[PDB]
Amino acid sequence: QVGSSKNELETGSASNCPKAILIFARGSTETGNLGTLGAPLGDALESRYGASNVWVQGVGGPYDAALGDNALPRGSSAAAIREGVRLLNLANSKCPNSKVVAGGYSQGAALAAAAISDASTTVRNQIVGTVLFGYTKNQQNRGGIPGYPQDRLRVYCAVGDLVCEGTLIVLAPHLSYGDEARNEAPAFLISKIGN
Numbered sequence: 001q002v003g004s005s006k007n008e009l010e011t012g013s014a015s016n017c018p019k020a021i022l023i024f025a026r027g028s029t030e031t032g033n034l035g036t037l038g039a040p041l042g043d044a045l046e047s048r049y050g051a052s053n054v055w056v057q058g059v060g061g062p063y064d065a066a067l068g069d070n071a072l073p074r075g076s077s078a079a080a081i082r083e084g085v086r087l088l089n090l091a092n093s094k095c096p097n098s099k100v101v102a103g104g105y106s107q108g109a110a111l112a113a114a115a116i117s118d119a120s121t122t123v124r125n126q127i128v129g130t131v132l133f134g135y136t137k138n139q140q141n142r143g144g145i146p147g148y149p150q151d152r153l154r155v156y157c158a159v160g161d162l163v164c165e166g167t168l169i170v171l172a173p174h175l176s177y178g179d180e181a182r183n184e185a186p187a188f189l190i191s192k193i194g195n
C-alpha cells in the first residue's frame, strides 16, 4: 500500500487554472498527503465539477504528520504550518481568480487552521470555504479559525470525539468522518465555490 496523494496545484499549468483548488492536510500517522478523508473529499468535488475543473493538493513536504507535533504550539510544527502557507500562497500567485477551499483532519485540521490564520487578508478572501474534521483546537479556538469568518467554516466534531474537547484522547468517534468527507463537507464547499 501507498498513501492516497494528489499534487495538482504543484503540477498544474498557471495558463490553465481551474474553477477550484482544494488544499488538504491529513491526520497524524496517515500516509500520502491526503490520508483517509482527503481523497474522498477531492473525489466529491471532482464528481461535481469535473476532474479537469478542480486541482486537489495535499500538504506534504515537511509535514510528516508526526504524533509528537500535536503537543506543539497551535497543534502542529511551525515547519508544517509554513508548508500550508506556501501552498496557499502558491494558489494565490499561480491562480488568483480560482476559488480555494481548505480542509484538514486531526493534526491536519490544526495545521490548516494555523496556516489560514497566518495567510494574508487577500489569500483568506480567496479561501471561500474550509472544512475541519476532528479539530484538535476546537475547544481552544472556540469552534473557529482565528481571523477567518465563521460563515466560511464547518467544523465536524463527532459526538464523543474528545480531541474536539481540549484533549488528545482519540476514540472511535475520531475515526467516523468518512461520511462527512463524502457528503456534508463537499456539499458545504460546493455552496461556497458556487455551481
Ligand code: NA
Pocket (backbone or CB within 6 Å): 008, 046, 050, 051, 052, 053, 054, 055, 056
Ligand atoms: Na483534478
Ligand code: NA
Pocket (backbone or CB within 6 Å): 158, 176, 177, 178, 179, 180
Ligand atoms: Na460521521
